[PDB]
């Protein structure tokens, strides 16, 4: 945002005094703007909203539709789960719930786990979901044809380092640099 | 940034308006004083 | 420094008000208007 | 061009903020409370109809800590908002309402039902108040400390989504300080003349009991209404007098620092010394307080530590780089710096910890609404709104399918 | 060349050139649709064949075709100036919706082909006329009253309070009291004669019960007034009971707080630090805020209401009714303001939303 500094500088035409630009403005006229209804092609349901546009671009298209990209999701209903997307600890219900939720939260694993329903299904950590998603993607790749454990070691190493009591933090960090 | 620009612009504009009013009042006071001194100098020129 | 990737203010000089404004970076606000942001750098006095 | 005719409603615990998308500040800010009279909600709405004394009129709040307590009173609040402050019939304007993350999902469903069915707005959306407060500052990785009159809470947000289970709730809020100053009034015997009777200002020097007269025309007022107005008076007192110590409260320092002066509505005036510094320490350490001092009470620094800890380290470093303080209670003088030192002690400074600067009344209260204004005019966001034709099934299924 | 300062009141339209001390053209904001279209100056004379509409209610534009016609009249008849050759400064009530400001910009640039435009808040312009860096503005305009706190020229939108009584409904209440007197004034012409009676006679009393006692004890309050029909009437007790309604809206029958109470409310809504400075600088603007003695009644009222420790000063210059137009003229005459105009290029590229990017 800012750090409490001078105000922004904005474009202006009527610097000087509209005696300079009297001619440059009088000789031209504006393109007629209109409040026009539009429907974004990115909308699965064809709802319509208003906004200001030039009345020569009316109803053309919504430039932000190109931001509507989505990441893929695997598919299985009756037999692909048993044949290819096999599992022995996760039910079809839990896998489908996790997959729909991952689409909800666009494979943002942390908030995915945050939502992961702990009372419709048994508890588990983020890296379990991450590695299971990797496994399902690998299986899909095979039919359609770095290490989670070290990440757990990560979480525990950071937890130990930070939970370290302040005096030990200072002493060890001294010991850290001395050698 | 727009809020910052608007606060700074309102400050500058209101303070320029206050400046306009103060300069105007000082100009009227100076005009009265100058008229008094001009009449005094005309009196001095005639007496002289 | 900490190497923040977004706060890339830099020395700039305008053309009509031809002077070194100091640390300023360019941005597009609503309506497609290119705005220069600014810092109140401690170098502010050096730019005389 | 990214804007639509969007209205951003941000109903917190104290005041309702209604304004148009793209607006720098909320258009209107009038209190959550609302008047009542015998027959349904025969009524009185904003700071102009909620203050004139009346024959046995009673004041209630359709809200409580942000969750709706009476949907009919909420509906009439909204009706008056649209009728006068925004003065545009609601049938055309997309709306996005802010709800506290801990507000029930069923209440979100019922709110959507009321909105769409009755008011027949053509679009809708929901996004949490903490989410919107972090929205205002442009930060994906942020930690929010919201503290209004009725509740104080700390909530982290990453990727713009709340860590829904990472919610910390602490009644140590504006009402906590208000009760503390109330017991202060009682202990040193302030008689709280309500401003609405006083008609004379025979003021007196320091400490003396000021003289005054009550207007003969005054009719009887229900106790709830008088309670509300004197509560507003003591809220003004909270704003004016309270100050927070930089470090842990000390008696000798608190006495040494110069006292401050407050005058009451009737002309009674008094000077405060160490008590004003002591009071916010109650928020920062509930133990010293009367009654509301059990170990169950959790202070600000403990609240932030608890909220930060409950989330794993994949985002905790992000929380380190930005601590965002919003809501009313954060405006107590020198509260933010005290919180900053408090966290610098509680949270190991071993890694990168920064605050995020925001001071003024506009920036703290309305940062919840400012984020909503930022969203509503956002170009990509226009696809997200719940349309009426969508609503036909969305109010039930997609009010959750869409708004996390 | 000169900038056009058109102030769109709630029943009174003021126009003139930037730098002029007073609004040259003042005409009521009436528009009539025959039973062609005519605006106040001719509309007020053409009533018999005409039905009169107001395009501004409570300072917010009601419908845009009538306001279009008001601006057409303003320029081409009252000012005779070409809109294509002069910059235009428009003033709109505080808390005007975004759509209304955008439509104002659209109407100006599209229909009237103005080269440069600006929309400024009426209260801030009244402050400019007063000439104070910070202040609280009480503008009892033509159709609505607004209490606007201003810090460093920046209007604080959250604290602005609207109370929906002002000169017009006050005149209606005067018509009520005047029927109570035993007279009768119902027609539009009779309503305007009551308007003239209000302008000539009434005042804001320093003390209500005291003045009731005085009126009962003394007949001196009675003054004679001459009607267009030729007869003569006397107005006494009514001279202040109607203005008294400002501070006790219950007299109107409206169920809201009075002017001084609403000013207290607005002051409270502002940040505590600047409350002292707002107290020191209270500005009375608007058309119906220029009753005699109203300033002193306000002074006593908010001395009583406000903490006795803070000096309340009431600023009500003798021509406060035009203070908004004078502020507009001062603003348009500034060299520093010239950089704030909205040019044709900026509307052409950014559209009506440009009014919000640089013109608050
Ligand atoms: N100067 C002040 N400093 C601190 N608190 C203040 C001040 N002035 C008023 N307050 C009180 O602080 C609170 C203002 O915040 P408010 O209750 O409006 O927050 P909110 O945005 O609605 O959030 P929340 O969901 O926490 O209630 C109210 O209790 C108000 O009485």
mmCIF file of N, CA and C in Angstrom, chain D residues 3 20-27 29 44 47-49 51-52 54 84-87 195 201 203 236 239-240 261 263 362 366, chain E residues 60 95-98 102 154 157-158 161-163 255-257 261 265 268-269 272 275 303-309 353 357 360:
data_model
loop_
_atom_site.group_PDB
_atom_site.id
_atom_site.type_symbol
_atom_site.label_atom_id
_atom_site.label_comp_id
_atom_site.label_asym_id
_atom_site.label_seq_id
_atom_site.Cartn_x
_atom_site.Cartn_y
_atom_site.Cartn_z
ATOM 1 N N UNK D 3 -16.585 -2.107 -12.562
ATOM 2 C CA UNK D 3 -17.572 -1.808 -11.538
ATOM 3 C C UNK D 3 -18.979 -2.180 -11.989
ATOM 4 N N UNK D 20 -21.755 2.166 -1.636
ATOM 5 C CA UNK D 20 -21.652 1.652 -2.992
ATOM 6 C C UNK D 20 -20.242 1.156 -3.270
ATOM 7 N N UNK D 21 -20.152 0.127 -4.107
ATOM 8 C CA UNK D 21 -18.856 -0.423 -4.470
ATOM 9 C C UNK D 21 -18.013 0.632 -5.170
ATOM 10 N N UNK D 22 -16.710 0.596 -4.915
ATOM 11 C CA UNK D 22 -15.802 1.599 -5.410
ATOM 12 C C UNK D 22 -15.657 2.802 -4.507
ATOM 13 N N UNK D 23 -16.599 3.009 -3.593
ATOM 14 C CA UNK D 23 -16.524 4.139 -2.680
ATOM 15 C C UNK D 23 -15.351 3.970 -1.728
ATOM 16 N N UNK D 24 -14.648 5.070 -1.478
ATOM 17 C CA UNK D 24 -13.511 5.032 -0.570
ATOM 18 C C UNK D 24 -13.951 4.685 0.846
ATOM 19 N N UNK D 25 -15.082 5.223 1.287
ATOM 20 C CA UNK D 25 -15.587 5.060 2.640
ATOM 21 C C UNK D 25 -17.058 4.678 2.574
ATOM 22 N N UNK D 26 -17.577 3.997 3.595
ATOM 23 C CA UNK D 26 -19.014 3.708 3.611
ATOM 24 C C UNK D 26 -19.845 4.980 3.554
ATOM 25 N N UNK D 27 -20.938 4.912 2.794
ATOM 26 C CA UNK D 27 -21.814 6.068 2.652
ATOM 27 C C UNK D 27 -22.396 6.491 3.993
ATOM 28 N N UNK D 29 -23.139 5.378 8.355
ATOM 29 C CA UNK D 29 -22.698 4.619 9.523
ATOM 30 C C UNK D 29 -23.623 4.988 10.678
ATOM 31 N N UNK D 44 -38.151 3.151 14.882
ATOM 32 C CA UNK D 44 -37.194 4.248 14.959
ATOM 33 C C UNK D 44 -35.831 3.650 14.644
ATOM 34 N N UNK D 47 -29.391 7.272 14.086
ATOM 35 C CA UNK D 47 -29.007 8.303 15.037
ATOM 36 C C UNK D 47 -29.675 9.613 14.659
ATOM 37 N N UNK D 48 -30.946 9.749 15.029
ATOM 38 C CA UNK D 48 -31.754 10.907 14.672
ATOM 39 C C UNK D 48 -33.202 10.589 15.025
ATOM 40 N N UNK D 49 -33.558 9.304 14.971
ATOM 41 C CA UNK D 49 -34.846 8.826 15.457
ATOM 42 C C UNK D 49 -34.677 7.911 16.663
ATOM 43 N N UNK D 51 -32.739 8.717 19.281
ATOM 44 C CA UNK D 51 -32.175 9.504 20.369
ATOM 45 C C UNK D 51 -33.178 10.450 21.015
ATOM 46 N N UNK D 52 -34.180 10.902 20.271
ATOM 47 C CA UNK D 52 -35.162 11.812 20.850
ATOM 48 C C UNK D 52 -35.943 11.044 21.911
ATOM 49 N N UNK D 54 -38.863 9.616 24.234
ATOM 50 C CA UNK D 54 -40.211 9.300 23.792
ATOM 51 C C UNK D 54 -40.965 8.603 24.913
ATOM 52 N N UNK D 84 -33.888 5.502 2.733
ATOM 53 C CA UNK D 84 -33.362 6.839 2.980
ATOM 54 C C UNK D 84 -31.877 6.983 2.686
ATOM 55 N N UNK D 85 -31.015 6.170 3.299
ATOM 56 C CA UNK D 85 -29.589 6.464 3.214
ATOM 57 C C UNK D 85 -29.050 6.188 1.819
ATOM 58 N N UNK D 86 -29.397 5.038 1.247
ATOM 59 C CA UNK D 86 -29.066 4.765 -0.145
ATOM 60 C C UNK D 86 -30.182 5.218 -1.079
ATOM 61 N N UNK D 87 -31.400 5.370 -0.568
ATOM 62 C CA UNK D 87 -32.546 5.894 -1.314
ATOM 63 C C UNK D 87 -32.561 5.386 -2.753
ATOM 64 N N UNK D 195 -27.598 13.247 28.449
ATOM 65 C CA UNK D 195 -27.637 14.571 27.809
ATOM 66 C C UNK D 195 -29.030 15.015 27.398
ATOM 67 N N UNK D 201 -26.327 24.857 32.094
ATOM 68 C CA UNK D 201 -24.905 24.561 32.226
ATOM 69 C C UNK D 201 -24.288 25.405 33.335
ATOM 70 N N UNK D 203 -21.985 25.137 35.257
ATOM 71 C CA UNK D 203 -20.821 24.289 35.450
ATOM 72 C C UNK D 203 -20.101 24.645 36.745
ATOM 73 N N UNK D 236 -18.390 7.205 24.489
ATOM 74 C CA UNK D 236 -17.628 8.428 24.267
ATOM 75 C C UNK D 236 -16.532 8.567 25.313
ATOM 76 N N UNK D 239 -13.677 6.339 24.359
ATOM 77 C CA UNK D 239 -12.877 6.929 23.293
ATOM 78 C C UNK D 239 -11.975 8.032 23.830
ATOM 79 N N UNK D 240 -12.506 8.880 24.709
ATOM 80 C CA UNK D 240 -11.795 10.096 25.085
ATOM 81 C C UNK D 240 -10.704 9.831 26.118
ATOM 82 N N UNK D 261 -8.294 15.257 31.643
ATOM 83 C CA UNK D 261 -9.537 15.886 32.064
ATOM 84 C C UNK D 261 -10.669 15.412 31.168
ATOM 85 N N UNK D 263 -15.066 16.037 31.006
ATOM 86 C CA UNK D 263 -16.259 16.696 31.521
ATOM 87 C C UNK D 263 -17.485 15.898 31.113
ATOM 88 N N UNK D 362 -11.840 5.657 10.311
ATOM 89 C CA UNK D 362 -12.301 5.135 9.030
ATOM 90 C C UNK D 362 -11.617 3.811 8.723
ATOM 91 N N UNK D 366 -14.244 0.593 9.311
ATOM 92 C CA UNK D 366 -14.759 0.352 7.974
ATOM 93 C C UNK D 366 -13.824 -0.482 7.114
ATOM 94 N N UNK E 60 -31.263 15.582 -3.872
ATOM 95 C CA UNK E 60 -30.897 14.472 -4.741
ATOM 96 C C UNK E 60 -31.783 14.539 -5.974
ATOM 97 N N UNK E 95 -23.808 12.831 0.194
ATOM 98 C CA UNK E 95 -24.411 11.502 0.173
ATOM 99 C C UNK E 95 -25.211 11.265 -1.105
ATOM 100 N N UNK E 96 -24.795 11.882 -2.200
ATOM 101 C CA UNK E 96 -25.389 11.584 -3.496
ATOM 102 C C UNK E 96 -24.891 10.227 -3.982
ATOM 103 N N UNK E 97 -25.777 9.316 -4.385
ATOM 104 C CA UNK E 97 -25.316 8.006 -4.855
ATOM 105 C C UNK E 97 -24.304 8.132 -5.985
ATOM 106 N N UNK E 98 -23.514 7.070 -6.158
ATOM 107 C CA UNK E 98 -22.536 7.047 -7.240
ATOM 108 C C UNK E 98 -23.215 7.173 -8.595
ATOM 109 N N UNK E 102 -22.402 9.884 -11.634
ATOM 110 C CA UNK E 102 -22.023 9.398 -12.956
ATOM 111 C C UNK E 102 -22.992 9.892 -14.020
ATOM 112 N N UNK E 154 -11.673 17.874 3.759
ATOM 113 C CA UNK E 154 -12.192 16.555 3.423
ATOM 114 C C UNK E 154 -13.467 16.314 4.216
ATOM 115 N N UNK E 157 -17.688 11.452 5.250
ATOM 116 C CA UNK E 157 -19.020 10.959 4.864
ATOM 117 C C UNK E 157 -19.735 10.186 5.956
ATOM 118 N N UNK E 158 -19.005 9.481 6.818
ATOM 119 C CA UNK E 158 -19.666 8.665 7.832
ATOM 120 C C UNK E 158 -20.449 9.519 8.820
ATOM 121 N N UNK E 161 -25.037 13.874 8.613
ATOM 122 C CA UNK E 161 -26.384 13.565 9.063
ATOM 123 C C UNK E 161 -27.400 14.341 8.242
ATOM 124 N N UNK E 162 -28.463 13.654 7.848
ATOM 125 C CA UNK E 162 -29.541 14.241 7.071
ATOM 126 C C UNK E 162 -30.801 14.275 7.917
ATOM 127 N N UNK E 163 -31.413 15.448 8.007
ATOM 128 C CA UNK E 163 -32.712 15.610 8.635
ATOM 129 C C UNK E 163 -33.639 16.231 7.605
ATOM 130 N N UNK E 255 -40.757 13.321 13.461
ATOM 131 C CA UNK E 255 -40.403 12.541 14.641
ATOM 132 C C UNK E 255 -38.895 12.396 14.784
ATOM 133 N N UNK E 256 -38.157 13.461 14.478
ATOM 134 C CA UNK E 256 -36.703 13.452 14.492
ATOM 135 C C UNK E 256 -36.187 14.570 15.387
ATOM 136 N N UNK E 257 -34.876 14.566 15.608
ATOM 137 C CA UNK E 257 -34.251 15.559 16.467
ATOM 138 C C UNK E 257 -34.161 16.909 15.761
ATOM 139 N N UNK E 261 -29.666 19.603 18.060
ATOM 140 C CA UNK E 261 -29.440 18.233 18.500
ATOM 141 C C UNK E 261 -28.752 17.419 17.411
ATOM 142 N N UNK E 265 -25.172 15.508 17.378
ATOM 143 C CA UNK E 265 -24.995 14.133 16.928
ATOM 144 C C UNK E 265 -23.863 14.034 15.918
ATOM 145 N N UNK E 268 -20.545 14.387 17.573
ATOM 146 C CA UNK E 268 -20.190 13.159 18.275
ATOM 147 C C UNK E 268 -19.671 12.108 17.308
ATOM 148 N N UNK E 269 -20.305 11.978 16.145
ATOM 149 C CA UNK E 269 -19.903 10.927 15.219
ATOM 150 C C UNK E 269 -18.475 11.108 14.721
ATOM 151 N N UNK E 272 -12.736 12.104 18.137
ATOM 152 C CA UNK E 272 -12.740 12.944 19.331
ATOM 153 C C UNK E 272 -11.706 14.057 19.215
ATOM 154 N N UNK E 275 -12.903 17.103 17.349
ATOM 155 C CA UNK E 275 -14.180 17.653 17.795
ATOM 156 C C UNK E 275 -14.023 19.083 18.290
ATOM 157 N N UNK E 303 -23.786 25.617 23.154
ATOM 158 C CA UNK E 303 -23.035 25.861 24.379
ATOM 159 C C UNK E 303 -23.564 24.986 25.503
ATOM 160 N N UNK E 304 -24.891 24.893 25.624
ATOM 161 C CA UNK E 304 -25.479 24.033 26.645
ATOM 162 C C UNK E 304 -25.162 22.568 26.374
ATOM 163 N N UNK E 305 -25.396 22.116 25.142
ATOM 164 C CA UNK E 305 -25.205 20.707 24.820
ATOM 165 C C UNK E 305 -23.738 20.313 24.907
ATOM 166 N N UNK E 306 -22.864 21.095 24.285
ATOM 167 C CA UNK E 306 -21.466 20.731 24.199
ATOM 168 C C UNK E 306 -20.791 20.876 25.557
ATOM 169 N N UNK E 307 -19.653 20.214 25.752
ATOM 170 C CA UNK E 307 -18.868 20.465 26.962
ATOM 171 C C UNK E 307 -18.565 21.948 27.095
ATOM 172 N N UNK E 308 -18.736 22.470 28.308
ATOM 173 C CA UNK E 308 -18.492 23.888 28.536
ATOM 174 C C UNK E 308 -17.035 24.258 28.305
ATOM 175 N N UNK E 309 -16.139 23.271 28.254
ATOM 176 C CA UNK E 309 -14.714 23.546 28.136
ATOM 177 C C UNK E 309 -14.289 23.926 26.724
ATOM 178 N N UNK E 353 -17.421 7.087 -14.719
ATOM 179 C CA UNK E 353 -16.756 6.748 -13.466
ATOM 180 C C UNK E 353 -15.626 7.712 -13.140
ATOM 181 N N UNK E 357 -12.815 9.312 -9.708
ATOM 182 C CA UNK E 357 -11.365 9.179 -9.643
ATOM 183 C C UNK E 357 -10.680 10.460 -9.191
ATOM 184 N N UNK E 360 -14.114 14.226 -6.077
ATOM 185 C CA UNK E 360 -14.825 14.310 -4.808
ATOM 186 C C UNK E 360 -14.321 15.528 -4.049
#
